Design a protein around this ligand. Structure first.
Ligand SMILES: [K+]
Ligand SMILES: [K+]
Ligand SMILES: [K+]
Ligand SMILES: [K+]
Ligand SMILES: [K+]
Ligand SMILES: [K+]
Ligand SMILES: [K+]
Ligand SMILES: [K+]
Ligand SMILES: [K+]
Ligand SMILES: [K+]
Ligand SMILES: [K+]
Ligand SMILES: [K+]
Ligand SMILES: [K+]
Ligand SMILES: [K+]
Ligand SMILES: [K+]
Ligand SMILES: [K+]
Ligand SMILES: [K+]
Ligand SMILES: [Mg+2]
Ligand SMILES: [Mg+2]
Ligand SMILES: [Mg+2]
Ligand SMILES: [Mg+2]
Ligand SMILES: [Mg+2]
Ligand SMILES: [Mg+2]
Ligand SMILES: [Mg+2]
Ligand SMILES: [Mg+2]
Ligand SMILES: [Mg+2]
Ligand SMILES: [Mg+2]
Ligand SMILES: [Mg+2]
Ligand SMILES: [Mg+2]
Ligand SMILES: [Mg+2]
Ligand SMILES: [Mg+2]
Ligand SMILES: [Mg+2]
Ligand SMILES: [Mg+2]
Ligand SMILES: [Mg+2]
Ligand SMILES: [Mg+2]
Ligand SMILES: [Mg+2]
Ligand SMILES: [Mg+2]
Ligand SMILES: [Mg+2]
Ligand SMILES: [Mg+2]
Ligand SMILES: [Mg+2]
Ligand SMILES: [Mg+2]
Ligand SMILES: [Mg+2]
Ligand SMILES: [Mg+2]
Ligand SMILES: [Mg+2]
Ligand SMILES: [Mg+2]
Ligand SMILES: [Mg+2]
Ligand SMILES: [Mg+2]
Ligand SMILES: [Mg+2]
Ligand SMILES: [Mg+2]
Ligand SMILES: [Mg+2]
Ligand SMILES: [Mg+2]
Ligand SMILES: [Mg+2]
Ligand SMILES: [Mg+2]
Ligand SMILES: [Mg+2]
Ligand SMILES: [Mg+2]
Ligand SMILES: [Mg+2]
Ligand SMILES: [Mg+2]
Ligand SMILES: [Mg+2]
Ligand SMILES: [Mg+2]
Ligand SMILES: [Mg+2]
Ligand SMILES: [Mg+2]
Ligand SMILES: [Mg+2]
Ligand SMILES: [Mg+2]
Ligand SMILES: [Mg+2]
Ligand SMILES: [Mg+2]
Ligand SMILES: [Mg+2]
Ligand SMILES: [Mg+2]
Ligand SMILES: [Mg+2]
Ligand SMILES: [Mg+2]
Ligand SMILES: [Mg+2]
Ligand SMILES: [Mg+2]
Ligand SMILES: [Mg+2]
Ligand SMILES: [Mg+2]
Ligand SMILES: [Mg+2]
Ligand SMILES: [Mg+2]
Ligand SMILES: [Mg+2]
Ligand SMILES: [Mg+2]
Ligand SMILES: [Mg+2]
Ligand SMILES: [Mg+2]
Ligand SMILES: [Mg+2]
Ligand SMILES: [Mg+2]
Ligand SMILES: [Mg+2]
Ligand SMILES: [Zn+2]
Lengths: 138, 208, 124, 104, 83, 99
RNA sequence: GGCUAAUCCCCCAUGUGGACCCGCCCCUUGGGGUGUGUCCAAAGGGCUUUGCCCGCUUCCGGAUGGGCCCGCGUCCCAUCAGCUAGUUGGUGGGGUAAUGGCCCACCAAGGCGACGACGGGUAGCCGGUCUGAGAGGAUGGCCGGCCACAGGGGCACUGAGACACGGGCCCCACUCCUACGGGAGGCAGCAGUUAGGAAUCUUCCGCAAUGGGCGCAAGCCUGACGGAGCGACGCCGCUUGGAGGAAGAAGCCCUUCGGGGUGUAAACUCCUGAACCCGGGACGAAACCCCCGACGAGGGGACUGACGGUACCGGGGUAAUAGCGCCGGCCAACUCCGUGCCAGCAGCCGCGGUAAUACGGAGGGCGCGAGCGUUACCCGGAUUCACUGGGCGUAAAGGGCGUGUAGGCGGCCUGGGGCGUCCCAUGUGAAAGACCACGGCUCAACCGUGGGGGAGCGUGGGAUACGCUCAGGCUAGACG
RNA sequence: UCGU
């Protein structure tokens, strides 16, 4: 049993990107899908699609990267440089609208989960609501 | 206890010329002509690359030795500036530049800032028609700095205000030489002042 | 430590141990001399330092350094301790204040005079 | 408003009085993680009307005795010793940590 | 009884009182019930006396007993002027 | 020395006496009626209960009992009497009780 | 022992009304209405004395003040792990303004604890204060709020209120008077003395102002307060000069012996003019009172200033205190002589053993300046107890291993509830302080007015993604 | 042997 699937996903993604995989599957959950949406919408990942593996529901997340580079180590820049779990089972993190953080002077984002649904730090602020600060991404 | 001691020796230590006598610090005698080097038995010896601290410290000493203020009052102003809204560097120079004794010097009512100081302490100066004997009194825009009638006929005030005939005055100021009046138009901008001081180094000095 | 662990035990605020048990945590303590020996320095120094056993008003018996060129401290000399260890003599953690009570001030002292307690010479 | 709390009856061994264990949840003042804390209350029960496992609503009331300032405002749900048992075991747990100790 | 009096707030030689509504038994500069005015004995400014007359009227309507000097000032602001 | 306001002490003793004495009567009469009521003697138990009622109120006329101390007394008194008369009583003199 | 007045005490009456018992109704813990029975009132005084004033009695309400109760929060040690008999609850009673083991009688056998009981240590708590980027740490003097105490302990009396700092009683310790029987005391009020201590002030002026007590008022009391005194203890302001001019020193004291430095610096020339038994001189103070009016609203009127002859204005007018620390690196400022592991320095690293920028002195220099240093203590730097924000192969740190109790944590789908969480509105968040603005004192410190923010909690309304819970389902974990 |  995974201990915290959201973390598991953020990490499958962190890992897969570090070796520049084209995509990566993660056990499917409405919730994880919700997060993927923002990820795609914000353009950190090409996209994602539901796919069964061994007859079980996963989410093929399609990674995205920058262009090949110069000098030694022609490895591309990551689109998802960062990406960390904030709230966690056994240290849940909640915030009010006035406490939503401004990830990377705006160049980054934060994904909260509100009773209005999973939103980015700008959306949540827009609809004036707060909630569980799920993660950070830049 | 505003210092009080040999002055055309601070300029020597400060490398740059500090006009702390007004007159003479112009003639071929300000020493900065013959002996621009620091004072003392080692003033001519080979210089040793100053430390970051040294640079900042000397710069603070320069800017402050110009207005002849205490480190106490000097610091008080700087703190007040950090607190005010607006680039500390300038704001600070503005406040410095708003001391009555200073303004009395800018209007030429006196040769030096030191002389201008005594002129305030001795009541020869008037803000808006009322006497003000506080060298640190802060002049605000619109205030008219003048010379007490009773002082108007003073030998010094004559030679002085005479020497100001057809003489230029800072853009943020303005003086009617005849009536011996003057107005503080507005706070000088960094651009309005041109002191041998990089006030940024000063802000840094008070950040250590 | 896990957060649960921190909730369970939390961090321990570290306490501070005084170097000057001059009790009453006063700035100075008054005392009287007993011995008025001399001690050999340690580590790599060598000299005959003037020290003093002092019965403090704080019901304490301690060795206090006697700074300055020379002194006049006897056995029943009343003194004022000011706290300050002497890096060379382990066991000495307080200085005697020249200029107070029986402790005379250093005579012919012309520089760091406020210390050693010596009035200003009537230069003329 | 008079306070109203909800808890489980963990004691019935008193005449006209039941012990109500009330639970409370909240983020830790410095470490954040939500932590469960609780307190036992001695609510007043004139008709011996309530028994163990009973989840009741306690209401702030005029003192009925020393150590007893609440009345049983009503039953929320009947029988359920999952809670009583829990309480009891934690209590039985104590029957250990000392000089002797059980085996649990 | 509850009173309407002065509370010292200025400085040495620089008095400034507050027209206050407090229980007779409290310190004078103690904790009042409500501020309803202020007074500058030396009129160092044109605004050396203000009094929320509506409020002054309230307290008097329920038993507030003004000091003589308190009453004097209140009157000066027409608290009683029925004219 | 000599703080003339020891006259207060002086006076308190006189008052102490006054109060002290009024209460004794009250207690004594009450017990008396409660005693009669119990023994079933109704007409006189009430008669006295009535005196006690009066004495109590008067005690509260000034600063002896005042407050609701009077009320408690009369209450507990009219309480015990009416009840003790549950021995075939039948409020004969229908004194203070309003049956 | 005797006499005597009253707004002293008591009796009878009147009963608006109110208290109590019982019944009924409405409300819902002892709230309110109602009926019968019962019980309960009072004080007089003053006159511009035939109506006004001060006051008295009962009741309902207001206002202010307060008691008691409850949720949550409040230091260290677990080398304190079990605690408890009025102890937990009940019934009846007592007691109180009132709830309550508050206390008592009887009955029951309970209550509390690892979410830290019990015990030990320490400590008044708060608004705030200091520090910090913040989170936090530290702290609670002055000022405002609350609590507690009045030589130590116990107790009640009188009162609307006390278990009463300048009231009372007893026990104790101590001082004092004593004809030895016995009495008298309580500065943790202002000031002052003494002791202790490194250390903390005048046996001051005034009641003029603000405020308090009593009085119809005049007014009386007020060490509260308003002021002055002493102390660089703190903060702010200010002065020891300004402008012009390089003798130039037996000796202090540098050198290549050419000179360099102190230095425009200079009891030496011109200007202003801190101080200064010199003239005038305050706001704070206009009420209570009196008269007219109607003892109202209004309107006129005597009176009264400690601070103080102070501030401040005007005149005259002297050139008129500078000190302390430091100069090896950190850290701004270097040379000579003396000394020779000595004398000594020293925050840490270190310096002195014959060329010492580190010791002491001198010249010079740096820093700050009516101050400058030192010691002590607090926060910082210290992400060096790490929540923000740390670690454990070899640096300190994985428990010798397991089993499993409490606890912490919990896969995928749906539904209910809406505890956590989030949003809205609202109440609360005293004043002071802090921040911003304007303003008063010549500035400032200081002060005045106004403005803004605000977590936490209460109330009402709402949301449901996540966490929780209840219900159902699944099979990817687990087990068979 | 001690301090460089
Ligand atoms: K046990
Ligand atoms: K009746
Ligand atoms: K009332
Ligand atoms: K009330
Ligand atoms: K209350
Ligand atoms: K009872
Ligand atoms: K602060
Ligand atoms: K605090
Ligand atoms: K504290
Ligand atoms: K009165
Ligand atoms: K003058
Ligand atoms: K001179
Ligand atoms: K030599
Ligand atoms: K030297
Ligand atoms: K520290
Ligand atoms: K080990
Ligand atoms: K072991
Ligand atoms: Mg976090
Ligand atoms: Mg600024
Ligand atoms: Mg050595
Ligand atoms: Mg030290
Ligand atoms: Mg030294
Ligand atoms: Mg039962
Ligand atoms: Mg009397
Ligand atoms: Mg009897
Ligand atoms: Mg007699
Ligand atoms: Mg009477
Ligand atoms: Mg009637
Ligand atoms: Mg009657
Ligand atoms: Mg009459
Ligand atoms: Mg009872
Ligand atoms: Mg009762
Ligand atoms: Mg009472
Ligand atoms: Mg008890
Ligand atoms: Mg204590
Ligand atoms: Mg920090
Ligand atoms: Mg700060
Ligand atoms: Mg206080
Ligand atoms: Mg005492
Ligand atoms: Mg006592
Ligand atoms: Mg009483
Ligand atoms: Mg008393
Ligand atoms: Mg008391
Ligand atoms: Mg006393
Ligand atoms: Mg005293
Ligand atoms: Mg002494
Ligand atoms: Mg007075
Ligand atoms: Mg008065
Ligand atoms: Mg000063
Ligand atoms: Mg010379
Ligand atoms: Mg000169
Ligand atoms: Mg002259
Ligand atoms: Mg006037
Ligand atoms: Mg008339
Ligand atoms: Mg009038
Ligand atoms: Mg008067
Ligand atoms: Mg003149
Ligand atoms: Mg240096
Ligand atoms: Mg020697
Ligand atoms: Mg040498
Ligand atoms: Mg030296
Ligand atoms: Mg820290
Ligand atoms: Mg951490
Ligand atoms: Mg570490
Ligand atoms: Mg090892
Ligand atoms: Mg190791
Ligand atoms: Mg191992
Ligand atoms: Mg388990
Ligand atoms: Mg779950
Ligand atoms: Mg669970
Ligand atoms: Mg659900
Ligand atoms: Mg909810
Ligand atoms: Mg709020
Ligand atoms: Mg406030
Ligand atoms: Mg101003
Ligand atoms: Mg101002
Ligand atoms: Mg304000
Ligand atoms: Mg709500
Ligand atoms: Mg819903
Ligand atoms: Mg739901
Ligand atoms: Mg299920
Ligand atoms: Mg050696
Ligand atoms: Zn110059």
């Amino acid at each position: 049993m995974l201990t915290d699937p959201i973390a598991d996903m953020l990490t499958r993604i962190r890992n897969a990107t570090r070796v520049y995989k084209e995509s990566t599957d993660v056990p499917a959950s409405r919730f994880k899908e919700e997060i993927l949406r923002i990820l795609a919408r914000e353009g950190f990942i090409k996209g994602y699609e539901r796919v069964d593996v061994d007859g079980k529901p996963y989410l093929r997340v399609y990674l995205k990267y920058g262009p090949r580079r110069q000098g030694p180590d022609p490895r591309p820049e990551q689109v998802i440089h960062h990406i960390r779990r904030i709230s966690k089972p056994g240290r849940r993190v909640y915030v009010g609208v006035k406490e939503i953080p401004r990830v990377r002077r705006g160049l980054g984002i934060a994904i909260l989960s509100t009773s209005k649904g999973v939103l980015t730090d700008r959306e949540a602020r827009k609809l004036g609501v707060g909630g569980e600060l799920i993660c950070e991404v830049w | 206890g505003r210092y009080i001691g040999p002055v055309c020796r601070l300029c020597r230590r400060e490398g740059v010329k500090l006009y702390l006598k007004g007159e003479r610090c112009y003639s071929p005698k300000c020493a900065m002509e013959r002996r621009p080097y620091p004072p003392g038995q080692h003033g001519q010896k080979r210089a040793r690359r100053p430390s970051d601290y040294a640079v900042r410290l000397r710069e603070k000493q320069k800017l402050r030795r110009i207005y002849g203020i205490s480190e106490r009052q000097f610091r008080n102003l700087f703190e007040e500036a950090s607190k005010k809204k607006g680039v500390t560097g300038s704001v600070f120079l503005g406040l410095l530049e708003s001391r009555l004794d200073n303004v009395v010097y800018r209007l030429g009512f006196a040769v030096s800032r030191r002389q201008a100081r005594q002129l305030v302490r001795h009541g020869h100066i008037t803000v808006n028609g009322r006497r003000v004997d506080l060298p640190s009194y802060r002049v605000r825009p619109g205030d008219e700095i003048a010379v007490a009638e009773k002082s108007r006929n003073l030998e010094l005030i004559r030679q002085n205000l005479e020497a100001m005939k057809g003489r230029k005055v800072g853009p943020w100021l303005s003086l009617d030489v005849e009536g011996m009046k003057g107005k503080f138009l507005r706070l000088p901008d960094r651009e309005d002042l041109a002191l041998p001081v990089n006030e940024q180094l000063v802000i840094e000095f008070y950040s250590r | 430590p896990t957060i649960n662990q921190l909730v369970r035990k939390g961090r321990e605020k570290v306490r501070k141990k005084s170097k000057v048990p001059a009790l009453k945590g006063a700035p100075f303590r008054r005392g009287v001399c007993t011995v008025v020996r001399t001690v050999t320095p340690k580590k790599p120094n060598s000299a005959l330092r003037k020290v003093a056993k002092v019965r403090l008003t704080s019901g304490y018996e301690v060795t206090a350094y006697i700074p300055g060129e020379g002194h006049n401290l006897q056995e029943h000399s009343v003194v004022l301790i000011r706290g300050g260890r002497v890096k060379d003599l382990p066991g000495v953690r307080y200085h005697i204040v020249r200029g107070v009570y029986d402790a005379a001030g250093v005579k012919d002292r012309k520089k760091s005079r406020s210390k050693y307690g010596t009035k200003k010479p009537k230069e003329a | 408003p008079k306070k109203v709390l909800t808890g489980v009856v963990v004691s019935d061994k008193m005449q006209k009085t039941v012990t109500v264990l009330v639970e409370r949840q909240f983020p830790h003042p410095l470490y954040g993680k939500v932590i469960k804390r609780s307190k036992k209350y001695l609510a007043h029960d004139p008709e011996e009307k309530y028994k163990l496992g009973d989840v009741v609503e306690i209401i702030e009331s005029r003192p009925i005795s020393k150590r007893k300032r609440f009345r049983v405002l009503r039953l929320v749900e009947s029988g359920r010793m999952d809670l009583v048992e829990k309480y009891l075991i934690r209590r039985q747990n104590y029957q250990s940590l000392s000089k002797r100790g059980g085996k649990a | 009884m509850v009173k309407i009096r002065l509370a010292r707030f200025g400085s040495k030689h620089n008095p400034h009182y507050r027209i206050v509504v407090t229980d007779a038994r409290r310190k004078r500069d103690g904790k009042y019930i409500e501020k309803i005015g202020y007074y500058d004995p030396r009129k160092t400014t044109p605004d050396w006396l203000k009094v929320d007359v509506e409020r002054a009227r309230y307290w008097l309507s329920v038993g507030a007993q003004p000091t003589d000097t308190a009453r004097r000032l209140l009157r000066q602001a027409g608290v009683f002027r029925q004219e | 020395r000599n703080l003339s306001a020891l006259k207060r002490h002086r006076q308190s003793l006189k008052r102490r006496l006054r109060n002290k004495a009024k209460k004794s009567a009250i207690k004594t009469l009450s017990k008396k009626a409660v005693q009669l009521a119990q023994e079933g003697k109704a007409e006189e138990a009430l008669k006295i209960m009535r005196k006690a009622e009066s004495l109590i109120d008067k005690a509260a006329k000034g600063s002896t009992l005042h407050k609701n101390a009077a009320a408690r007394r009369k209450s507990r008194l009219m309480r015990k009497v009416r009840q003790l008369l549950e021995a075939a009583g039948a409020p004969l003199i229908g004194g203070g009780l309003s049956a």
